[PDB]
Amino acid sequence: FRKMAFPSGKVEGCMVQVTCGTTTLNGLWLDDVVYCPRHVICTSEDMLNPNYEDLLIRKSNHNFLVQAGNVQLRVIGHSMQNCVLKLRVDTANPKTPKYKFVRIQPGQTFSVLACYNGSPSGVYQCAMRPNFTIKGSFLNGSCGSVGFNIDYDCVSFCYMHHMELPTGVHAGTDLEGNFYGPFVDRQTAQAAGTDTTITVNVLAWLYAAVINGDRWFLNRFTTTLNDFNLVAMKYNYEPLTQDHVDILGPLSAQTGIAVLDMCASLKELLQNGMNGRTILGSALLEDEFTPFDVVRQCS
Amino acid sequence: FRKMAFPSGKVEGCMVQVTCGTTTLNGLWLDDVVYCPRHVICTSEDMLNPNYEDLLIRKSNHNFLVQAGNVQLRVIGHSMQNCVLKLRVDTANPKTPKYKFVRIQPGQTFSVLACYNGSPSGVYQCAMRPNFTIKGSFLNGSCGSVGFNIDYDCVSFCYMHHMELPTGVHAGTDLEGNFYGPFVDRQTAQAAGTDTTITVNVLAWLYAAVINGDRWFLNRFTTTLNDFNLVAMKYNYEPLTQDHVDILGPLSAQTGIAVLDMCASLKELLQNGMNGRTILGSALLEDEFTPFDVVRQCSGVV
Ligand SMILES: CC(C)(C)[C@H](NC(=O)C(F)(F)F)C(=O)N1C[C@H]2[C@@H]([C@H]1C(=O)N[C@H](C=N)C[C@@H]1CCNC1=O)C2(C)C
Ligand SMILES: CC(C)(C)[C@H](NC(=O)C(F)(F)F)C(=O)N1C[C@H]2[C@@H]([C@H]1C(=O)N[C@H](C=N)C[C@@H]1CCNC1=O)C2(C)C
Numbered sequence: 053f054r055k056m057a058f059p060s061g062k063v064e065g066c067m068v069q070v071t072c073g074t075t076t077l078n079g080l081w082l083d084d085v086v087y088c089p090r091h092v093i094c095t096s097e098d099m100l101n102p103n104y105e106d107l108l109i110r111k112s113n114h115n116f117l118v119q120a121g122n123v124q125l126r127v128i129g130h131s132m133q134n135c136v137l138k139l140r141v142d143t144a145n146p147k148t149p150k151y152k153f154v155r156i157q158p159g160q161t162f163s164v165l166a167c168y169n170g171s172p173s174g175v176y177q178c179a180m181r182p183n184f185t186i187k188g189s190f191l192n193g194s195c196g197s198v199g200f201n202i203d204y205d206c207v208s209f210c211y212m213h214h215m216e217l218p219t220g221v222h223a224g225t226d227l228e229g230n231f232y233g234p235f236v237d238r239q240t241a242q243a244a245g246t247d248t249t250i251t252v253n254v255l256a257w258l259y260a261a262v263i264n265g266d267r268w269f270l271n272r273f274t275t276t277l278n279d280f281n282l283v284a285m286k287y288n289y290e291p292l293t294q295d296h297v298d299i300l301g302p303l304s305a306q307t308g309i310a311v312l313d314m315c316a317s318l319k320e321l322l323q324n325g326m327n328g329r330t331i332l333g334s335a336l337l338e339d340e341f342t343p344f345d346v347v348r349q350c351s
Numbered sequence: 352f353r354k355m356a357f358p359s360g361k362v363e364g365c366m367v368q369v370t371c372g373t374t375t376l377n378g379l380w381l382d383d384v385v386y387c388p389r390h391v392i393c394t395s396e397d398m399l400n401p402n403y404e405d406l407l408i409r410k411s412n413h414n415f416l417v418q419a420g421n422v423q424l425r426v427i428g429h430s431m432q433n434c435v436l437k438l439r440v441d442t443a444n445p446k447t448p449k450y451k452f453v454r455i456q457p458g459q460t461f462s463v464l465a466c467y468n469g470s471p472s473g474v475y476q477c478a479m480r481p482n483f484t485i486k487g488s489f490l491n492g493s494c495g496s497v498g499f500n501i502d503y504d505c506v507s508f509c510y511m512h513h514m515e516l517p518t519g520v521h522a523g524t525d526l527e528g529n530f531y532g533p534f535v536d537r538q539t540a541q542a543a544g545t546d547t548t549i550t551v552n553v554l555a556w557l558y559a560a561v562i563n564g565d566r567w568f569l570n571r572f573t574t575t576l577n578d579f580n581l582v583a584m585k586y587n588y589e590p591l592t593q594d595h596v597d598i599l600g601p602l603s604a605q606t607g608i609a610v611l612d613m614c615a616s617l618k619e620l621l622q623n624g625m626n627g628r629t630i631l632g633s634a635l636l637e638d639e640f641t642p643f644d645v646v647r648q649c650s651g652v653v
Binding site for chain 1: 352353354355356357358359360361363364464465471472473474475477486487488490519633634635647648649650651652653
């Protein structure tokens with residue numbers, strides 16, 4: 053049972069390089085617009101305390117160098133939408149897929165295509181954490197890499213990468229330029245809210261463990277939804293709603309384990325610990341598989 | 352530190368579907384040849400005990416339905432090479448990347464593009480285990496999905512998927528049709544052998560830890576390679592080869608920790624355990640990152 057990303061090719065054909073001065077990062081080229089993080093306009097010194105509207109008014113179209121592979125795209129217009137810059141170019145991208153911009157909910161997952169200098173580097177799956185950070189793998193020059201999901205050849209872009217917090221987690225925006233979380237695109241010490249664990253995802257993953265034949269954590273105890281939620285809150289787990297119970301329906305029907313029965317197992321896991329044992333090869337309870345991710349891989 | 356697959360676009364453009372009878376699986380379309388598992392020619396009853404040479408004699412070019420999407424590619428020739436079928440088609444794939452076929456060693460990792468009906472579905476990173484299985488995610492119809500690495504726009508194909516063993520792990524061939532491990536493409540009682548831990552990759556993981564400042568496990572001991580190999584096997588760890596010592600060269604140089612010093616550090620971990628501390632925030636020693644994977648992730652390769 054593996055974390056599985058979507059095939060990245062439809063996104064690869066959209067990645068370009070954007071340079072302003074000596075600051076270079078990635079952009080997303082859809083039709084005749086390139087989307088990229090607005091801090092491309094900052095000198096490394098500007099990033100310490102930027103006034104973006106002031107910085108942007110001092111730029112012309114010619115200050116932006118957009119490279120698609122070896123070919124330069126002429127910038128014929130620019131505007132800022134929140135923390136994203138939209139560069140109108142003189143060429144429409146022939147590989148533009150059917151796409152949508154979506155803002156995802158905490159606990160949902162997406163694939164990241166990490167890129168450097170407009171060139172794709174690697175692909176992996178992330179979840180939007182409850183504190184609105186992601187546990188990614190990004191280095192210098194990765195900004196403008198995007199997160200996405202793919203549904204019947206439609207790419208739903210949900211994340212553009214902007215920054216790494218001192219704890220090593222990552223923060224970014226939707227494609228309208230609005231940050232996930234209480235962060236700002238300024239080079240200054242920033243911390244996230246205390247994180248919490250995505251309960252419905254842990255349950256989905258326990259169902260995956262049972263499907264794959266691992267049942268040592270199961271029990272005969274029972275719990276009500278409210279009593280489970282009291283324990284979840286005590287252990288910094290997110291509340292489980294009735295909608296989550298409904299969403300876990302198919303996995304519950306497939307394994308014959310009632311949702312509240314799996315909740316009772318999780319409650320004892322939180323209260324007893326894992327006694328050094330593992331589940332699906334993991335020494336910790338995994339919360340980055342949604343119920344959808346689990347069904348898509350088991351079914 | 353996380354499992355990063357290669358971008359899959361160059362491989363997606365090569366995936367087709369191959370049907371013989373009612374059996375559909377995936378094929379790899381490079382230039383004017385489609386490569387696929389030979390059991391596409393079997394009926395469900397055939398797979399229980401197939402004679403591939405005679406079953407292939409009873410097939411002709413016009414028995415093979417090869418489709419890119421729903422577009423049929425006319426088959427103009429067929430041959431069998433080990434457990435792969437090679438179907439010559441009348442159209443050269445314009446999306447063919449620069450490519451090589453390679454046979455990998457246990458411990459080496461690769462990206463898998465899981466496909467169904469010729470349509471790519473997902474991508475993930477896999478390590479070839481010492482017992483010649485991969486811990487993959489493959490459902491019905493996944494056969495012919497491929498594994499690959501990339502280096503500077505050259506795709507090295509190393510795996511084609513054929514089967515699932517009862518423990519849930521997966522087995523297949525190189526692109527010349529030779530199985531990894533003792534497996535055969537027959538629906539017969541087969542089982543994965545006992546597995547071992549990939550020592551060279553654990554060591555790479557230890558170097559990755561050191562690079563990030565997590566180095567409590569660096570001890571004052573060293574060892575010889577032969578002494579280490581003999582002890583590691585008592586802990587179900589693979590012995591190191593000379594090639595393993597050399598592939599750890601770059602990480603040894605970057606950290607200044609000699610390979611045999613790191614072997615001595617790992618030996619102490621095996622002999623005394625962790626003692627309730629973690630490495631890279633884990634109580635388990637990870638063995639599915641190669642030394643190249645560590646450098647690839649810590650650098651910005653393409
Ligand atoms: C870690 C760094 C301290 C230097 C800083 N972080 C914080 O200032 C914080 F603490 F507020 F997060 C930070 O990320 N940036 C500083 C400057 C941009 C951003 C930045 O360099 N983005 C990179 C885009 N190519 C991706 C980074 C590089 C390392 N890994 C990544 O993911 C902006 C906020 C404008
Ligand atoms: C698990 C199955 C019992 C049915 C059987 N296994 C064993 O007979 C073993 F136990 F010996 F391995 C087995 O896999 N096959 C039987 C028959 C081919 C192969 C097969 O169906 N391949 C599928 C290709 N599309 C991929 C499979 C589907 C499930 N998950 C996968 O990956 C061949 C060996 C010729």
